[PDB]
Amino acid sequence: AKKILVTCALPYANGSIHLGHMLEHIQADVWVRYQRMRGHEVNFICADDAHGTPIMLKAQQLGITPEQMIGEMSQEHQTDFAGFNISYDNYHSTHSEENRQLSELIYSRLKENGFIKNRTISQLYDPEKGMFLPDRFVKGTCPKCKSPDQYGDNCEVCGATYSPTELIEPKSVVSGATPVMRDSEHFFFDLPSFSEMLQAWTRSGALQEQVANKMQEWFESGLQQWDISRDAPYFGFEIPNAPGKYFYVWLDAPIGYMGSFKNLCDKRGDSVSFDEYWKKDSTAELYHFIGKDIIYFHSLFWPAMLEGSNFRKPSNLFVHGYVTVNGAKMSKSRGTFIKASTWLNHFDADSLRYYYTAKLSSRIDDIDLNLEDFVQRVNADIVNKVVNLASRNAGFINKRFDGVLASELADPQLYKTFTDAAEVIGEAWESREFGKAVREIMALADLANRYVDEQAPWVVAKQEGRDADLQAICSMGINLFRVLMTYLKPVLPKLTERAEAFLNTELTWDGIQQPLLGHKVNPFKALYNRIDMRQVEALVEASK
Ligand code: MET
Ligand SMILES: [Zn+2]
């Protein structure tokens, strides 16, 4: 029995959960649910990423404390993830005492071990507000084309890129004051000292090939020291012994994985598991599910931080691509930038979980939610292949056989074909080849429906003296449904609950080896209804 700690990336507290977040959290949750079904000790950990200058400024503009704002968004996020049945064992915050203490500890160890350097830099500063300006809080006139009202390091009219210090007549986005260059001492993490260690990790074959290829590009460009401090005013953790200095959000954010696990252990009264999972000698496995925009932090800074502070490193990184809708990046004007909360007003969680799972693989390629295909695939696969095996057979069992399934399998060979597939399907879930698993499951569903078609229960049912045959056929179909729903249990939690209620049994991975014989099932109302394009049109309209 393995010990496994799985995370998803920590969502920022200054925006709502959308379908891009949901791709990642669904992918991880399917994997986690499968690992639990195979008997492992699994800890599925997340948290909101609650620090930084954008969050501080947003709270100020709303006239509330950052603490109030992040608390509201934490509740909103957790409500949405709960609505998709994301099965976290703990959902915490980077703004927490556990993360403060662990961030201070890691920084102190890195500093004692020689990996922290102090250097003065020059940066644009708003002297009226009294704060250093990140690039996107400087606006001005493009030096190339002279277009006004351009933000940061690029012009949205002519496409030019430049340092914000080249903007003509620059203005602070916060106050409107003219910014000036000002010096400040910053603290830097000496990432280059870990180059050889990180190159050996890249070559080991654990990482996705596409991720290893990106790493080689980054080694070729040259690793640099990493600026891990920000000046007051800031919403974050103060640096010990450095008044007016704070840790940059991205230093504390991955430490938040550790902080969330520590919080879970502490709430459970468990004084041993934190060190069992995070010490250098750990035999537990640690996996981070992340998107391709945040690889650098997780594959270079983070393993180096851990190595330099005497903690174990990730076992693997599992990186996914971006979500597209109708083939294109989500578009607010077209109504394809869809919030998780909006989704649930129109469709259930299982439909999106299924669709994403059917498209996902172990590679980093983008995943397209084609809304026409979504309707067609949910209806074809869930309603007409899988649920059909229950719905077409359960009525006869309940009405003519008192709910009782036959005492023997009508076609034991066919049943064995279904149970023999468990090894390949389980390996597909394990390896994150979700689309392969779904293809295998649906091929079996096709075989099951062909069996029922070949036996023609709608004929047998009207023919005198054929009650035993009818019960046999319908019971066989229900047993095939039991197996298919076991394979899909990681994917479709709510349908699975309805299936378990109908079947009067919890679905376990090994349970499929004992078919339901001489066994009472319950009646049900529709296990899963069809969807249509009018609902898609409503979703898009509601998102504009
Ligand atoms: C430690 S993962 C932090 C992820 C970051 N909040 C993001 O959304 O990209
Ligand atoms: Zn320009």
Side-chain angles (χ1 to χ4, degrees):
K2 303 166 184 179
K3 290 186 178 181
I4 302 171
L5 191 171
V6 172
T7 66
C8 292
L10 310 187
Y12 277 125
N14 58 324
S16 300
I17 303 309
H18 55 64
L19 295 188
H21 295 105
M22 291 316 309
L23 179 65
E24 182 173 287
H25 291 252
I26 290 167
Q27 182 186 35
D29 189 66
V30 172
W31 198 76
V32 162
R33 284 181 183 270
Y34 173 71
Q35 296 298 334
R36 293 196 190 110
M37 286 189 76
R38 301 313 304 272
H40 302 309
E41 174 177 313
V42 186
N43 285 289
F44 185 17
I45 296 307
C46 198
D48 266 9
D49 192 351
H51 288 159
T53 300
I55 281 167
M56 181 189 82
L57 291 171
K58 185 174 167 193
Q60 289 182 4
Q61 78 122 219
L62 295 175
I64 56 179
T65 61
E67 288 89 349
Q68 185 187 320
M69 187 180 77
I70 67 171
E72 293 176 358
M73 189 59 82
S74 175
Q75 288 303 298
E76 188 189 305
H77 286 178
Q78 291 182 71
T79 293
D80 290 349
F81 291 134
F84 281 91
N85 301 307
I86 311 302
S87 63
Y88 314 107
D89 298 285
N90 205 40
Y91 197 102
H92 199 41
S93 179
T94 60
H95 194 61
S96 65
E97 265 304 293
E98 294 88 351
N99 203 34
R100 179 190 78 82
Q101 288 188 16
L102 286 164
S103 290
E104 293 185 10
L105 177 68
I106 286 166
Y107 172 76
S108 76
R109 290 178 176 181
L110 293 175
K111 185 171 174 48
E112 197 239 28
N113 284 336
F115 302 123
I116 299 301
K117 317 303 176 169
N118 303 9
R119 184 158 59 258
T120 297
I121 68 175
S122 183
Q123 181 180 356
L124 286 163
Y125 176 82
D126 178 337
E128 179 179 321
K129 178 67 174 178
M131 67 180 288
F132 283 100
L133 295 174
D135 288 357
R136 75 186 196 86
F137 296 96
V138 185
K139 65 177 174 186
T141 293
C142 172
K144 305 295 174 36
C145 77
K146 311 301 188 297
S147 283
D149 308 312
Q150 297 308 307
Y151 291 71
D153 68 2
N154 66 97
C155 178
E156 291 176 12
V157 182
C158 74
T161 57
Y162 39 79
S163 171
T165 61
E166 302 177 58
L167 283 167
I168 291 167
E169 292 299 288
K171 310 294 177 188
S172 169
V173 170
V174 180
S175 73
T178 301
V180 297
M181 298 305 292
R182 185 179 180 95
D183 284 354
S184 177
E185 180 181 48
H186 279 246
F187 298 111
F188 291 79
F189 174 57
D190 190 19
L191 173 69
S193 289
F194 299 85
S195 179
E196 302 190 32
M197 184 281 277
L198 294 164
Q199 293 178 61
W201 192 38
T202 298
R203 291 189 290 261
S204 67
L207 294 172
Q208 290 155 290
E209 181 175 283
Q210 290 163 299
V211 175
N213 290 343
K214 284 179 188 296
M215 288 279 278
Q216 292 304 340
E217 297 172 12
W218 294 330
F219 295 131
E220 176 61 30
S221 294
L223 304 185
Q224 303 292 321
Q225 289 185 358
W226 183 32
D227 184 350
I228 60 154
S229 63
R230 297 296 185 275
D231 287 276
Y234 200 74
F235 184 60
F237 294 147
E238 308 171 6
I239 301 188
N241 304 303
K245 309 293 180 175
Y246 287 80
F247 294 122
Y248 180 43
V249 38
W250 264 114
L251 182 80
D252 85 53
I255 302 177
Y257 296 135
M258 300 175 77
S260 181
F261 193 60
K262 181 174 193 303
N263 173 255
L264 177 58
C265 292
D266 292 351
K267 287 191 298 201
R268 292 170 165 173
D270 176 346
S271 63
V272 301
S273 289
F274 184 88
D275 289 349
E276 285 175 353
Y277 278 77
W278 289 97
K279 69 188 176 178
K280 284 176 67 161
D281 47 326
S282 177
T283 57
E285 306 173 16
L286 173 62
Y287 301 110
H288 302 303
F289 283 86
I290 61 176
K292 57 185 172 193
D293 47 316
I294 61 177
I295 299 170
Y296 205 102
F297 303 98
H298 286 84
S299 69
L300 292 166
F301 299 147
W302 178 227
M305 289 161 61
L306 290 164
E307 179 94 341
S309 61
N310 213 44
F311 289 105
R312 59 83 57 74
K313 291 163 284 199
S315 304
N316 294 88
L317 304 180
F318 299 147
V319 181
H320 60 78
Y322 302 135
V323 176
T324 56
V325 179
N326 295 337
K329 180 173 180 185
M330 287 190 287
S331 169
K332 169 53 100 142
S333 71
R334 292 177 177 78
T336 62
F337 176 73
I338 295 158
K339 291 178 185 301
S341 58
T342 302
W343 178 271
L344 293 170
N345 293 328
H346 295 89
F347 299 108
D348 71 357
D350 275 348
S351 64
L352 185 69
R353 295 174 62 105
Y354 178 68
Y355 191 88
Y356 280 167
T357 299
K359 298 276 200 99
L360 272 161
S361 74
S362 64
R363 298 183 63 75
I364 71 175
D365 310 333
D366 293 348
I367 300 295
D368 186 41
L369 176 60
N370 179 285
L371 293 170
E372 286 265 0
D373 187 62
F374 166 76
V375 169
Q376 292 194 40
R377 201 181 292 254
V378 166
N379 285 344
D381 291 357
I382 298 177
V383 177
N384 265 276
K385 291 186 192 191
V386 174
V387 171
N388 192 52
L389 291 168
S391 59
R392 75 196 296 192
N393 290 310
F396 290 123
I397 292 299
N398 289 318
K399 289 195 162 183
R400 286 175 59 168
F401 308 102
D402 303 310
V404 181
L405 304 175
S407 64
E408 298 92 27
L409 291 169
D411 193 335
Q413 277 182 279
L414 183 60
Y415 192 77
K416 186 169 186 303
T417 295
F418 278 59
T419 61
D420 278 352
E423 185 168 28
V424 60
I425 292 168
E427 179 52 37
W429 292 139
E430 176 87 37
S431 66
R432 316 192 314 292
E433 301 292 6
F434 286 6
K436 177 186 177 178
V438 169
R439 277 190 284 285
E440 297 279 6
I441 293 162
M442 294 298 157
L444 288 173
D446 287 338
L447 187 62
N449 283 290
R450 181 176 306 182
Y451 163 82
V452 180
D453 291 346
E454 285 167 6
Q455 300 300 309
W458 64 92
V459 165
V460 179
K462 77 182 170 176
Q463 295 177 331
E464 176 66 27
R466 301 199 69 188
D467 284 308
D469 293 340
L470 184 63
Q471 186 188 29
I473 295 164
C474 297
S475 299
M476 188 67 204
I478 291 166
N479 267 303
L480 297 177
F481 171 79
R482 186 281 187 82
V483 177
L484 296 174
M485 284 305 307
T486 304
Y487 296 152
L488 288 165
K489 173 161 179 167
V491 186
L492 305 172
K494 284 291 165 181
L495 178 56
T496 296
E497 289 181 348
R498 299 194 294 273
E500 289 173 328
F502 154 52
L503 293 171
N504 277 315
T505 186
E506 177 192 11
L507 300 176
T508 67
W509 196 262
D510 298 344
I512 66 182
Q513 297 293 339
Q514 294 81 50
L516 304 177
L517 304 176
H519 175 91
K520 172 73 168 59
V521 299
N522 297 318
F524 55 87
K525 213 172 101 162
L527 286 174
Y528 210 96
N529 300 316
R530 289 177 67 80
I531 57 176
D532 62 58
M533 280 298 303
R534 294 195 178 193
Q535 298 167 302
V536 164
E537 294 161 10
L539 169 69
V540 168
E541 175 64 25
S543 297
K544 283 174 168 171

